[PDB]
Amino acid sequence: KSRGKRSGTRYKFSKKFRKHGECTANKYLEKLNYGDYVDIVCDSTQQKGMPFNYYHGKTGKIFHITKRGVGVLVNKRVKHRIEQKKVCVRIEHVRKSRCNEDFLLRKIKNAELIKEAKLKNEHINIKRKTEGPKPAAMIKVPPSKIITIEPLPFY
Amino acid sequence: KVVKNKAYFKRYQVKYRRRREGKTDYRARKALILQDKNKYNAQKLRFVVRKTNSQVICQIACAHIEGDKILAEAKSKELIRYGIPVGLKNYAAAYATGLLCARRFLKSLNLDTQFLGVEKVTRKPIKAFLDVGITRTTTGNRVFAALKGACDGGLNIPHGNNRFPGSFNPEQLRKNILGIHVAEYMKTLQEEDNDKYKTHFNDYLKNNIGADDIEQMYLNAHEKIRQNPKKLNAKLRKKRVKEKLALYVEKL
Amino acid sequence: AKSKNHTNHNQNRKAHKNGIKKPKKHKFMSRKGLDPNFFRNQKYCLKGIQKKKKELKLKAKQEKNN
Amino acid sequence: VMREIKVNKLVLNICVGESGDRLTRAARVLEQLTEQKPIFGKCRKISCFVTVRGKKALEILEKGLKRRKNFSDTGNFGFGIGMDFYVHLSRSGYRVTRRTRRRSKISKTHKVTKEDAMKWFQTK
RNA sequence: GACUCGUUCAUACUACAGUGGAUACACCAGAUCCCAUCAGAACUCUGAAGUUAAGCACUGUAAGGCUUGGCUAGUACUGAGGUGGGAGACCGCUCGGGAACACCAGGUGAUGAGUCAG
RNA sequence: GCAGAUGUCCAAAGACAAGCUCAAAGAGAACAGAAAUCUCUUGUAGACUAAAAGGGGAAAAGCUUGUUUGAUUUCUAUUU
RNA sequence: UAGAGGACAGGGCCUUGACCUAUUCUCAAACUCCCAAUAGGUAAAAAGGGCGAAAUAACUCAAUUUGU
């Protein structure tokens, strides 16, 4: 019967234990660029410039920057299709993401390795390994460490 | 009951270290540091004036996620090399520290010839913003003295006349930055009783600093400065506690 | 007559019958009302670069067409 | 050592529980006692008081000198006579609990306590 | 050794004792002027006669707490399968994933930039 | 279905700045008491924040003071 | 839900309690210091990126050369 703004956030928007008090005085100092990937986290110490109920935890990208506002583009599901949505949030709530730091590190490794690989004219399986079947080898174990197992009785 | 229960200790949330020490504010700090995200690389340099009970310190600070960086520094105890061996908490001392800070910072950034400042007392210049330093910024404060000194040195900080002595007294501002009020206090105290005067300004009298000498001395200093810049481990803990128990067996 | 007041059955299957549709993800996004006083400068930037490039184009065209 | 308990605060308390006229008379007599303007209480206006230090504190304490049970735990006490009288004593360095820059508390080893309070009182 | 501006935002806290005072912070002398009050207690201004007593720094407590690791325990719990069992409530099995509280052991910080002093 | 609430109220209960820190408990002091004023010690909210409830809030978002009316004109990007 | 221990009121050293310290039996759709499997989200390089010059601007920055 009731579907207000902050409906059903009795715990979600609640600040975690021993984390009360204003936002960290260094979160303002992060650097943002157009095209970066960002995460949206709804903090409650700040009140204005607040995200909405559904968007807590989602991701996106930066396409709009004002004196304090940040506009992020998000894919929100509705029944049969996905439609872009632009949400304007504030710096306190917004938070730099990690969804692309893995790929950035991979690109840096590629740049600093395949350069010398090409210099030597070597081909590598630069695709991610996804280790599957282990190889077959020989191992040692003395008979003094083999501890048998047997099912246990009842009590 | 007892309010110091283990449950209370469990539920306590510690403060930030600086706030616990009382050194900082973490509202004025974040307001000062944060700048519009529309602009980029806007460092927003902050001038920092801190008064102890002995001397004042003036720094130039830049912000980082890793931590603040200090570019230029100045202490009150450098005025001996500029001719002031006494009274480093003085209003003129704060003014001199501000001017010293501004001049060193400008020289190190190599804009000395590009910014000559002002003379004596009455492209855009580089910018800085003043720190409050917790202290209640009432009318006529050493922090605003250092602010005026920096502005005269060549910096630009948006400041009004509200907390300058008078609400506006350029004569009193000149007197305070030149040390005139100190001279007048010397005159009055000397007239009223010599004993208190000597027991108070024993060091001024030792260095033989006349009342009508303070202002000219500070003026000369300003011109010169403008023209020239043990532990225990677990095993020992157990050993010593078991020894303590052994002694307490027959101690009391 | 009592009427069922709500249901959400079969909705997901109906949604996935046609496949979850994706937005077209075009390249450029319009700047109709985003943070003016910056694109205000950017438009002059584009006009200036285009003017220089086209005037050099016309200069070359004339000096090659006699 | 300077563990001497210099007098820190004297307070005169007046409580009538009615409106002015008598309240103004209490203010008048308090003014004639000490020239400092008094301070009121709450108006849920029912009481007033004043604080003093220094030589005035010494003189008024000696005047009020003219039972060793009513001493508080932390070296404070007082008595009546229609005026009141109350005192607070403490050792030096009390500032560190009040001034703004490095606010912090005093260890119990520096406080005065009642056992020393009686000693100081019967000494002075 | 000491301070200033920071980050990490309790291993950094808190209670109780011991240790450390040349500049250091700090207590401390004062109220003519800037400045504030009921009160020079606080705030502001001017000083440096005396000072580790206190704060501050360090250490100690079979200190509480905090925080890691072991153990709780493959236990509670649960996704898929089952013409499995049980009158039912519930309980097995295959492929799967995986707790917490209490308990025990160890520890009480690290750190950037800048400066003074020798 | 359940536990409730709304069709108002407010120049301050709005804006900003500055100062201070609340409940409670104990200890003490003419009348004076379980409760009446003051002071001290402890004190991570146990009070306060117009309303119901749920969040948030400590050099404050609370208490006191100061100056004030951005509770203004017009127009976009958008969320529920 | 019960005891173990301990310094404001009631009466005849004694009793009644309240109160305080550490224990104990069992709970909470509208309790949470903690926390699963399931389900949820994003990235995995060419209309793109990395690495330097040359231009442009009425934007920003102390910077027509700081940068964007």
Short mmCIF file of all heavy atoms in Angstrom, two decimals, chain D residues 2-3 36-37 39 51 53 95 99-102 104 107 110, chain E residues 4 15-17 25-28 38-39 42-43 53-55:
data_model
loop_
_atom_site.label_atom_id
_atom_site.label_comp_id
_atom_site.label_asym_id
_atom_site.label_seq_id
_atom_site.Cartn_x
_atom_site.Cartn_y
_atom_site.Cartn_z
N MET D 2 54.54 21.62 42.94
CA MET D 2 53.49 22.62 43.07
C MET D 2 52.13 21.94 43.21
O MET D 2 51.12 22.40 42.67
CB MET D 2 53.50 23.59 41.89
CG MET D 2 53.24 22.97 40.53
SD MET D 2 53.62 24.15 39.22
CE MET D 2 53.45 23.12 37.77
N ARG D 3 52.09 20.85 43.97
CA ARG D 3 50.82 20.19 44.26
C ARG D 3 50.11 20.91 45.40
O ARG D 3 49.70 20.28 46.38
CB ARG D 3 51.03 18.72 44.62
CG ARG D 3 50.84 17.77 43.46
CD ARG D 3 50.31 16.43 43.93
NE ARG D 3 51.30 15.68 44.69
CZ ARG D 3 52.21 14.89 44.14
NH1 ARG D 3 52.28 14.73 42.83
NH2 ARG D 3 53.07 14.25 44.92
N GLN D 36 29.87 42.30 40.91
CA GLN D 36 29.58 41.59 39.67
C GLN D 36 28.09 41.31 39.55
O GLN D 36 27.42 40.96 40.52
CB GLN D 36 30.37 40.28 39.62
CG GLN D 36 31.87 40.46 39.75
CD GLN D 36 32.63 39.19 39.45
OE1 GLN D 36 32.04 38.17 39.07
NE2 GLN D 36 33.94 39.23 39.61
N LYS D 37 27.57 41.47 38.33
CA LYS D 37 26.16 41.23 38.10
C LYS D 37 25.84 39.75 38.32
O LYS D 37 26.63 38.88 37.95
CB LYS D 37 25.76 41.65 36.69
CG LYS D 37 25.36 43.11 36.56
CD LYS D 37 24.01 43.38 37.22
CE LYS D 37 23.51 44.77 36.88
NZ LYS D 37 22.35 45.16 37.73
N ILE D 39 23.57 36.06 38.02
CA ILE D 39 23.07 35.27 36.91
C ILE D 39 21.85 34.49 37.38
O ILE D 39 21.81 33.99 38.51
CB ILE D 39 24.16 34.33 36.34
CG1 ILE D 39 23.67 33.62 35.07
CG2 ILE D 39 24.61 33.33 37.38
CD1 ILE D 39 23.37 34.56 33.93
N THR D 51 29.64 33.81 40.73
CA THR D 51 30.92 33.14 40.89
C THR D 51 32.02 34.18 41.07
O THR D 51 31.91 35.31 40.58
CB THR D 51 31.24 32.27 39.67
OG1 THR D 51 31.55 33.12 38.56
CG2 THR D 51 30.04 31.41 39.32
N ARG D 53 36.60 34.57 42.16
CA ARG D 53 37.91 33.96 42.34
C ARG D 53 38.81 34.94 43.10
O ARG D 53 38.40 36.05 43.46
CB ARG D 53 38.57 33.62 41.00
CG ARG D 53 37.92 32.50 40.21
CD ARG D 53 36.85 33.07 39.30
NE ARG D 53 36.39 32.11 38.30
CZ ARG D 53 35.30 31.36 38.43
NH1 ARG D 53 34.53 31.44 39.50
NH2 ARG D 53 34.99 30.50 37.47
N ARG D 95 43.48 23.51 33.58
CA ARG D 95 43.14 24.07 32.28
C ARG D 95 42.99 22.99 31.22
O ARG D 95 42.13 23.09 30.33
CB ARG D 95 44.21 25.09 31.88
CG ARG D 95 44.08 25.66 30.48
CD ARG D 95 45.04 26.82 30.29
NE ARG D 95 45.30 27.12 28.88
CZ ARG D 95 44.48 27.80 28.10
NH1 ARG D 95 43.32 28.26 28.55
NH2 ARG D 95 44.82 28.04 26.84
N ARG D 99 40.45 23.99 28.09
CA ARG D 99 40.77 24.73 26.88
C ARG D 99 40.67 23.83 25.66
O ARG D 99 40.73 22.60 25.74
CB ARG D 99 42.14 25.41 26.98
CG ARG D 99 43.37 24.58 26.66
CD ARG D 99 43.69 23.56 27.72
NE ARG D 99 44.97 22.92 27.47
CZ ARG D 99 45.15 21.90 26.66
NH1 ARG D 99 44.14 21.36 26.00
NH2 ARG D 99 46.38 21.40 26.50
N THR D 100 40.51 24.47 24.50
CA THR D 100 39.94 23.80 23.33
C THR D 100 40.95 22.98 22.54
O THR D 100 40.56 22.02 21.87
CB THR D 100 39.29 24.83 22.41
OG1 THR D 100 38.58 25.79 23.20
CG2 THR D 100 38.32 24.17 21.45
N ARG D 101 42.24 23.33 22.58
CA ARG D 101 43.17 22.78 21.61
C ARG D 101 43.43 21.29 21.85
O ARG D 101 43.40 20.50 20.90
CB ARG D 101 44.48 23.56 21.63
CG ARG D 101 44.44 24.83 20.80
CD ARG D 101 45.78 25.10 20.13
NE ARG D 101 46.19 24.00 19.27
CZ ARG D 101 47.42 23.49 19.22
NH1 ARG D 101 48.38 23.95 20.00
NH2 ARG D 101 47.68 22.50 18.38
N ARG D 102 43.69 20.89 23.09
CA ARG D 102 44.09 19.51 23.39
C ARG D 102 43.26 18.95 24.53
O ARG D 102 43.78 18.43 25.51
CB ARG D 102 45.57 19.42 23.74
CG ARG D 102 46.53 19.43 22.57
CD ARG D 102 46.75 20.84 22.05
NE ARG D 102 47.74 20.90 20.98
CZ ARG D 102 49.04 21.06 21.18
NH1 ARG D 102 49.55 21.18 22.40
NH2 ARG D 102 49.85 21.12 20.13
N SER D 104 41.53 17.08 27.25
CA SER D 104 41.82 15.77 27.82
C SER D 104 41.59 15.85 29.32
O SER D 104 41.49 16.93 29.89
CB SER D 104 43.25 15.33 27.50
OG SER D 104 44.19 16.25 28.03
N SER D 107 44.32 12.77 35.46
CA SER D 107 44.43 11.52 36.19
C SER D 107 43.98 11.71 37.63
O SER D 107 44.04 12.80 38.20
CB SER D 107 45.86 11.00 36.15
OG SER D 107 46.02 9.89 37.02
N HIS D 110 46.19 13.40 40.45
CA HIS D 110 46.33 14.84 40.60
C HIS D 110 45.16 15.49 41.32
O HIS D 110 45.26 16.66 41.70
CB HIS D 110 46.50 15.49 39.23
CG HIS D 110 47.28 16.77 39.26
ND1 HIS D 110 48.65 16.81 39.10
CD2 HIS D 110 46.88 18.05 39.44
CE1 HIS D 110 49.06 18.06 39.17
NE2 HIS D 110 48.01 18.83 39.38
P U E 4 52.58 19.69 17.34
OP1 U E 4 51.56 20.36 18.18
OP2 U E 4 52.63 18.21 17.28
"O5'" U E 4 52.43 20.25 15.86
"C5'" U E 4 52.72 21.61 15.57
"C4'" U E 4 52.72 21.86 14.09
"O4'" U E 4 53.97 21.41 13.51
"C3'" U E 4 51.66 21.10 13.31
"O3'" U E 4 50.39 21.72 13.35
"C2'" U E 4 52.26 21.03 11.91
"O2'" U E 4 52.07 22.26 11.23
"C1'" U E 4 53.75 20.88 12.22
N1 U E 4 54.21 19.47 12.21
C2 U E 4 54.35 18.83 10.99
O2 U E 4 54.08 19.37 9.93
N3 U E 4 54.79 17.53 11.06
C4 U E 4 55.11 16.83 12.20
O4 U E 4 55.50 15.66 12.13
C5 U E 4 54.95 17.56 13.41
C6 U E 4 54.52 18.83 13.38
P A E 15 40.79 6.67 30.98
OP1 A E 15 40.17 7.90 31.51
OP2 A E 15 42.12 6.74 30.32
"O5'" A E 15 40.90 5.62 32.17
"C5'" A E 15 39.74 5.17 32.85
"C4'" A E 15 40.08 4.09 33.84
"O4'" A E 15 40.28 2.83 33.15
"C3'" A E 15 41.38 4.29 34.61
"O3'" A E 15 41.24 5.17 35.71
"C2'" A E 15 41.75 2.87 35.01
"O2'" A E 15 40.96 2.44 36.11
"C1'" A E 15 41.31 2.09 33.77
N9 A E 15 42.41 1.92 32.81
C8 A E 15 42.63 2.65 31.67
N7 A E 15 43.68 2.29 30.99
C5 A E 15 44.20 1.24 31.74
C6 A E 15 45.32 0.43 31.54
N6 A E 15 46.14 0.56 30.50
N1 A E 15 45.58 -0.52 32.46
C2 A E 15 44.75 -0.64 33.50
N3 A E 15 43.66 0.07 33.80
C4 A E 15 43.44 1.01 32.86
P C E 16 42.49 6.08 36.15
OP1 C E 16 42.01 7.07 37.15
OP2 C E 16 43.18 6.55 34.93
"O5'" C E 16 43.45 5.05 36.90
"C5'" C E 16 42.98 4.30 38.01
"C4'" C E 16 43.88 3.13 38.31
"O4'" C E 16 43.91 2.22 37.18
"C3'" C E 16 45.34 3.47 38.54
"O3'" C E 16 45.61 3.97 39.84
"C2'" C E 16 46.03 2.14 38.24
"O2'" C E 16 45.88 1.24 39.32
"C1'" C E 16 45.19 1.64 37.07
N1 C E 16 45.78 2.03 35.77
C2 C E 16 46.95 1.39 35.33
O2 C E 16 47.44 0.51 36.05
N3 C E 16 47.50 1.75 34.15
C4 C E 16 46.93 2.70 33.42
N4 C E 16 47.50 3.02 32.26
C5 C E 16 45.74 3.36 33.83
C6 C E 16 45.21 3.00 35.00
P A E 17 46.87 4.93 40.07
OP1 A E 17 46.60 5.79 41.25
OP2 A E 17 47.19 5.56 38.76
"O5'" A E 17 48.06 3.94 40.42
"C5'" A E 17 49.37 4.43 40.65
"C4'" A E 17 50.43 3.41 40.30
"O4'" A E 17 49.98 2.60 39.19
"C3'" A E 17 51.76 3.98 39.84
"O3'" A E 17 52.60 4.35 40.93
"C2'" A E 17 52.33 2.85 38.99
"O2'" A E 17 52.92 1.85 39.81
"C1'" A E 17 51.07 2.28 38.36
N9 A E 17 50.80 2.83 37.02
C8 A E 17 49.71 3.59 36.66
N7 A E 17 49.70 3.93 35.40
C5 A E 17 50.86 3.36 34.89
C6 A E 17 51.42 3.37 33.61
N6 A E 17 50.86 4.00 32.57
N1 A E 17 52.58 2.71 33.42
C2 A E 17 53.13 2.08 34.46
N3 A E 17 52.70 2.00 35.72
C4 A E 17 51.54 2.67 35.87
P C E 25 56.89 24.55 20.81
OP1 C E 25 57.45 25.19 19.60
OP2 C E 25 57.21 25.12 22.14
"O5'" C E 25 55.31 24.49 20.67
"C5'" C E 25 54.49 24.29 21.81
"C4'" C E 25 54.17 22.84 22.02
"O4'" C E 25 55.38 22.13 22.40
"C3'" C E 25 53.21 22.53 23.15
"O3'" C E 25 51.85 22.70 22.77
"C2'" C E 25 53.57 21.10 23.53
"O2'" C E 25 53.00 20.19 22.61
"C1'" C E 25 55.08 21.11 23.32
N1 C E 25 55.82 21.38 24.57
C2 C E 25 56.21 20.30 25.36
O2 C E 25 55.92 19.16 24.97
N3 C E 25 56.89 20.52 26.51
C4 C E 25 57.17 21.77 26.88
N4 C E 25 57.84 21.95 28.02
C5 C E 25 56.79 22.89 26.10
C6 C E 25 56.12 22.65 24.96
P A E 26 50.99 23.90 23.38
OP1 A E 26 49.58 23.70 22.99
OP2 A E 26 51.67 25.17 23.04
"O5'" A E 26 51.09 23.67 24.95
"C5'" A E 26 50.56 22.48 25.51
"C4'" A E 26 50.89 22.32 26.97
"O4'" A E 26 52.31 22.10 27.16
"C3'" A E 26 50.61 23.50 27.88
"O3'" A E 26 49.23 23.66 28.18
"C2'" A E 26 51.46 23.18 29.10
"O2'" A E 26 50.81 22.21 29.91
"C1'" A E 26 52.68 22.53 28.45
N9 A E 26 53.82 23.46 28.38
C8 A E 26 54.21 24.32 27.38
N7 A E 26 55.28 25.01 27.70
C5 A E 26 55.60 24.59 28.98
C6 A E 26 56.62 24.94 29.89
N6 A E 26 57.57 25.84 29.63
N1 A E 26 56.64 24.33 31.10
C2 A E 26 55.69 23.43 31.35
N3 A E 26 54.68 23.02 30.59
C4 A E 26 54.70 23.65 29.41
P C E 27 48.70 25.06 28.77
OP1 C E 27 47.22 25.05 28.72
OP2 C E 27 49.46 26.14 28.09
"O5'" C E 27 49.15 25.02 30.30
"C5'" C E 27 48.59 24.07 31.19
"C4'" C E 27 49.44 23.88 32.43
"O4'" C E 27 50.82 23.62 32.06
"C3'" C E 27 49.54 25.06 33.37
"O3'" C E 27 48.40 25.24 34.19
"C2'" C E 27 50.80 24.73 34.16
"O2'" C E 27 50.53 23.71 35.11
"C1'" C E 27 51.68 24.14 33.06
N1 C E 27 52.56 25.17 32.47
C2 C E 27 53.60 25.68 33.25
O2 C E 27 53.77 25.25 34.40
N3 C E 27 54.41 26.64 32.75
C4 C E 27 54.21 27.09 31.52
N4 C E 27 55.04 28.04 31.06
C5 C E 27 53.16 26.60 30.70
C6 C E 27 52.36 25.65 31.21
P C E 28 47.85 26.72 34.50
OP1 C E 28 47.05 26.67 35.74
OP2 C E 28 47.25 27.25 33.26
"O5'" C E 28 49.17 27.57 34.81
"C5'" C E 28 49.80 27.50 36.08
"C4'" C E 28 51.10 28.27 36.11
"O4'" C E 28 51.88 27.97 34.92
"C3'" C E 28 50.98 29.78 36.10
"O3'" C E 28 50.69 30.32 37.37
"C2'" C E 28 52.34 30.21 35.56
"O2'" C E 28 53.32 30.14 36.57
"C1'" C E 28 52.61 29.12 34.53
N1 C E 28 52.19 29.50 33.16
C2 C E 28 52.78 30.58 32.48
O2 C E 28 53.67 31.25 33.02
N3 C E 28 52.36 30.89 31.24
C4 C E 28 51.41 30.16 30.66
N4 C E 28 51.03 30.49 29.43
C5 C E 28 50.80 29.05 31.32
C6 C E 28 51.22 28.76 32.55
P C E 38 27.44 38.44 30.83
OP1 C E 38 26.12 37.80 31.05
OP2 C E 38 27.59 39.48 29.78
"O5'" C E 38 27.92 39.08 32.21
"C5'" C E 38 27.29 38.73 33.43
"C4'" C E 38 28.30 38.46 34.52
"O4'" C E 38 27.69 37.60 35.51
"C3'" C E 38 29.54 37.71 34.08
"O3'" C E 38 30.50 38.51 33.39
"C2'" C E 38 29.99 37.00 35.36
"O2'" C E 38 30.66 37.87 36.25
"C1'" C E 38 28.64 36.66 35.99
N1 C E 38 28.16 35.30 35.68
C2 C E 38 28.19 34.35 36.69
O2 C E 38 28.62 34.68 37.81
N3 C E 38 27.75 33.09 36.44
C4 C E 38 27.29 32.77 35.24
N4 C E 38 26.87 31.53 35.03
C5 C E 38 27.25 33.72 34.18
C6 C E 38 27.68 34.96 34.44
P A E 39 31.54 39.49 34.14
OP1 A E 39 30.93 40.02 35.38
OP2 A E 39 32.06 40.43 33.12
"O5'" A E 39 32.74 38.52 34.54
"C5'" A E 39 33.54 38.77 35.68
"C4'" A E 39 34.05 37.49 36.27
"O4'" A E 39 32.97 36.51 36.30
"C3'" A E 39 35.15 36.79 35.50
"O3'" A E 39 36.43 37.34 35.75
"C2'" A E 39 35.00 35.34 35.95
"O2'" A E 39 35.58 35.15 37.23
"C1'" A E 39 33.49 35.22 36.08
N9 A E 39 32.87 34.67 34.85
C8 A E 39 32.76 35.28 33.62
N7 A E 39 32.17 34.54 32.71
C5 A E 39 31.89 33.36 33.38
C6 A E 39 31.26 32.18 32.96
N6 A E 39 30.81 31.99 31.73
N1 A E 39 31.12 31.19 33.87
C2 A E 39 31.58 31.39 35.11
N3 A E 39 32.19 32.46 35.62
C4 A E 39 32.31 33.42 34.69
P A E 42 41.66 29.64 31.97
OP1 A E 42 42.77 28.69 31.73
OP2 A E 42 41.97 31.08 32.15
"O5'" A E 42 40.62 29.50 30.76
"C5'" A E 42 40.17 28.22 30.34
"C4'" A E 42 39.00 28.31 29.39
"O4'" A E 42 37.93 29.08 30.00
"C3'" A E 42 39.26 29.01 28.07
"O3'" A E 42 39.84 28.15 27.11
"C2'" A E 42 37.87 29.49 27.66
"O2'" A E 42 37.13 28.43 27.07
"C1'" A E 42 37.24 29.82 29.02
N9 A E 42 37.34 31.25 29.36
C8 A E 42 37.88 31.78 30.50
N7 A E 42 37.83 33.09 30.55
C5 A E 42 37.22 33.44 29.37
C6 A E 42 36.90 34.68 28.82
N6 A E 42 37.15 35.83 29.43
N1 A E 42 36.30 34.70 27.61
C2 A E 42 36.06 33.54 27.00
N3 A E 42 36.32 32.30 27.41
C4 A E 42 36.91 32.32 28.62
P C E 43 40.90 28.71 26.04
OP1 C E 43 41.04 27.69 24.97
OP2 C E 43 42.10 29.17 26.78
"O5'" C E 43 40.18 29.99 25.41
"C5'" C E 43 39.30 29.85 24.30
"C4'" C E 43 38.94 31.19 23.71
"O4'" C E 43 38.22 31.98 24.68
"C3'" C E 43 40.11 32.08 23.30
"O3'" C E 43 40.63 31.74 22.03
"C2'" C E 43 39.49 33.47 23.33
"O2'" C E 43 38.73 33.71 22.16
"C1'" C E 43 38.53 33.35 24.52
N1 C E 43 39.11 33.86 25.78
C2 C E 43 39.30 35.23 25.95
O2 C E 43 39.02 36.01 25.03
N3 C E 43 39.82 35.69 27.11
C4 C E 43 40.13 34.84 28.08
N4 C E 43 40.64 35.34 29.21
C5 C E 43 39.94 33.43 27.94
C6 C E 43 39.42 33.00 26.79
P A E 53 57.19 14.31 38.39
OP1 A E 53 58.50 14.37 39.08
OP2 A E 53 56.45 13.03 38.34
"O5'" A E 53 56.24 15.41 39.04
"C5'" A E 53 55.59 15.18 40.27
"C4'" A E 53 54.21 15.79 40.29
"O4'" A E 53 54.30 17.24 40.33
"C3'" A E 53 53.34 15.52 39.07
"O3'" A E 53 52.76 14.23 39.07
"C2'" A E 53 52.33 16.65 39.15
"O2'" A E 53 51.36 16.39 40.16
"C1'" A E 53 53.21 17.81 39.62
N9 A E 53 53.73 18.59 38.48
C8 A E 53 55.04 18.79 38.11
N7 A E 53 55.18 19.53 37.04
C5 A E 53 53.87 19.83 36.68
C6 A E 53 53.34 20.58 35.62
N6 A E 53 54.08 21.19 34.70
N1 A E 53 52.00 20.69 35.54
C2 A E 53 51.25 20.09 36.46
N3 A E 53 51.64 19.35 37.50
C4 A E 53 52.98 19.26 37.55
P A E 54 52.68 13.40 37.70
OP1 A E 54 52.12 12.07 38.01
OP2 A E 54 54.00 13.50 37.03
"O5'" A E 54 51.61 14.19 36.82
"C5'" A E 54 50.24 14.20 37.20
"C4'" A E 54 49.42 15.17 36.39
"O4'" A E 54 49.99 16.51 36.47
"C3'" A E 54 49.32 14.91 34.89
"O3'" A E 54 48.37 13.91 34.57
"C2'" A E 54 48.95 16.28 34.35
"O2'" A E 54 47.57 16.54 34.55
"C1'" A E 54 49.75 17.20 35.26
N9 A E 54 51.05 17.56 34.67
C8 A E 54 52.30 17.28 35.15
N7 A E 54 53.27 17.73 34.39
C5 A E 54 52.60 18.35 33.34
C6 A E 54 53.06 19.02 32.20
N6 A E 54 54.35 19.19 31.91
N1 A E 54 52.14 19.52 31.35
C2 A E 54 50.85 19.36 31.64
N3 A E 54 50.29 18.74 32.68
C4 A E 54 51.24 18.26 33.50
P G E 55 48.68 12.84 33.42
OP1 G E 55 47.61 11.81 33.46
OP2 G E 55 50.09 12.41 33.55
"O5'" G E 55 48.51 13.66 32.06
"C5'" G E 55 47.23 14.09 31.62
"C4'" G E 55 47.32 15.16 30.57
"O4'" G E 55 48.22 16.22 31.01
"C3'" G E 55 47.89 14.74 29.22
"O3'" G E 55 46.92 14.12 28.40
"C2'" G E 55 48.40 16.06 28.65
"O2'" G E 55 47.33 16.81 28.09
"C1'" G E 55 48.88 16.78 29.90
N9 G E 55 50.34 16.66 30.10
C8 G E 55 50.98 16.15 31.21
N7 G E 55 52.28 16.19 31.11
C5 G E 55 52.51 16.75 29.87
C6 G E 55 53.73 17.04 29.21
O6 G E 55 54.89 16.84 29.61
N1 G E 55 53.52 17.61 27.96
C2 G E 55 52.29 17.87 27.42
N2 G E 55 52.29 18.42 26.20
N3 G E 55 51.14 17.61 28.02
C4 G E 55 51.33 17.05 29.24
#
